[PDB]
């Protein structure tokens, strides 16, 4: 009988304000601690905050500088506003009625969740650092390149201009809370080849029109 419905733009502009509302039916606006949680893709659940119909609010400390919540009792609605968003704020946003003191017998009520994507036309080219082979025996050594703080996806990494393909392992990027990506590419090579064979990672980030060649040397 109790029904919560999220509403608000699914596709939003970066740096602009992300706004969502929840409409409550079948329950009095005074019966719950009305709450927002989110789950960025591939990450865990994060409670954003809770508001009571009187205006009492409590916010996750990692978001309190950019988050406001409100309640409109005449529309039986509550709402969130999240400022200065980046790609890090792309997430499934879900509204809920939480039972602070376990006073209701059926537990909490939950909305359906909505995947909101923060869109940005901006770009930033990567910094590239060598992941040098240690000083390795017996057999093989790992060396690579760290491709840091770029936006948007994708970047491509090759080794020795594509001549080196075996033993290459490029790891999917992490999206950092800054809203920028980083990734690592690592190749395993004969330890016996370090003094003699040159190893160069070729990084191409077409959205920023950036290319970097990095020689990865011992030490």
């Amino acid at each position: 009988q109790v029904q919560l419905q999220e509403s608000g733009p699914g596709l939003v502009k970066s740096s602009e304000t992300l706004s969502l509302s929840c409409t409550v039916s079948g329950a009095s606006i005074s019966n719950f601690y009305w709450s927002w949680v989110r789950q960025p893709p591939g990450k865990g659940l994060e409670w954003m905050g809770s508001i009571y119909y009187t205006g009492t609010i409590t916010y996750n400390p990692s978001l309190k500088s950019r988050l406001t919540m409100s309640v409109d009792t005449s529309k039986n609605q509550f709402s969130l506003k999240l400022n200065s968003v980046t790609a890090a704020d792309t997430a499934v946003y879900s509204c809920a009625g939480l039972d602070r003191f376990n006073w209701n017998d059926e537990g909490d009520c939950w909305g359906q969740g909505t995947l909101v994507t923060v869109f940005s036309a901006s770009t930033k080219g990567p910094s590239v650092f060598p992941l040098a082979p240690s000083s390795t025996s017996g057999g093989t050594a790992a060396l690579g390149c760290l491709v840091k703080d770029y936006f948007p996806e994708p970047v491509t990494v090759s080794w020795n201009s594509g001549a080196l393909t075996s033993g290459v392992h490029t790891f999917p990027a992490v999206l950092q809370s800054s809203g920028l990506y980083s990734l690592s590419s690592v190749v395993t090579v004969p330890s016996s080849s370090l003094g003699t064979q040159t190893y160069i990672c070729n990084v191409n980030h077409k959205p920023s029109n950036t290319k970097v060649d990095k020689k990865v040397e011992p030490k």
């Binding site: 709450s35 949680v37 789950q39 893709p41 591939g42 990450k43 865990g44 659940l45 994060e46 409670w47 809770s50 409590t58 916010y59 996750n60 400390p61 499934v92 879900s94 809920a96 939480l98 039972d99 602070r100 376990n102 059926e106 537990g107 909490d108 939950w110 909305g111 359906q112 969740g113 995947l115 910094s127 650092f129 060598p130 992941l131 040098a132 790992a142 690579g144 760290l146 840091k148 392992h169 790891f171 999917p172 990027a173 992490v174 999206l175 950092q176 809370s177 980083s182 990734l183 690592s184 690592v186």
Partner: protein, 214 residues
Amino acid sequence: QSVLTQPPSASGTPGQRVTISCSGSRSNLGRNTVNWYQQLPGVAPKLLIYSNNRRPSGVPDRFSGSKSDTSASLAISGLQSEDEADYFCAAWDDSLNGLYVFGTGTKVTVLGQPKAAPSVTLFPPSSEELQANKATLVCLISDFYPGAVTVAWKADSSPVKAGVETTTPSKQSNNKYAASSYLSLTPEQWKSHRSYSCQVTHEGSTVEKTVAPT
């Protein structure tokens, strides 16, 4: 919020009983009840258990929950493919103005192949990154199954607060999984400690690698 600790992965074969632990503290589980949620991609969490051990209507009886003083448990008996999801405990926590704290989450897998333990490679910051006034430690994790791990970082022997970013696991060509974790430090932090460690937990295994500036 704070930290309710859960194992990264719980797994079994069809019909087996799986259990998931949740470890909290005095301020949350000590003084508040626990809820359990089932989490599928792209949708809101689904309430499985509330008030320690109560099921909402429609939730089968093979899900059951128990609670101690600062610990809690979810048991899924008769494991089915449909049960494959992430599971989160959660409790209110009386710190600050009142916080709702989710667990780190546990992936439940119906094993489709033998378990496989992770290999871990840890890279210190490069001298040229330090020359650019930055420091990043790189922890690369490969060849594990099921596809969930926990990565914890230590400075000397103490857990590191901030600066950690960890990817969700991704399936390799060989149908095992890989992930990576990054620790961001100032050069001062890196140079001023004795060592830093990347510690990877997976099912019945923990692997820890350590690097030092000296």
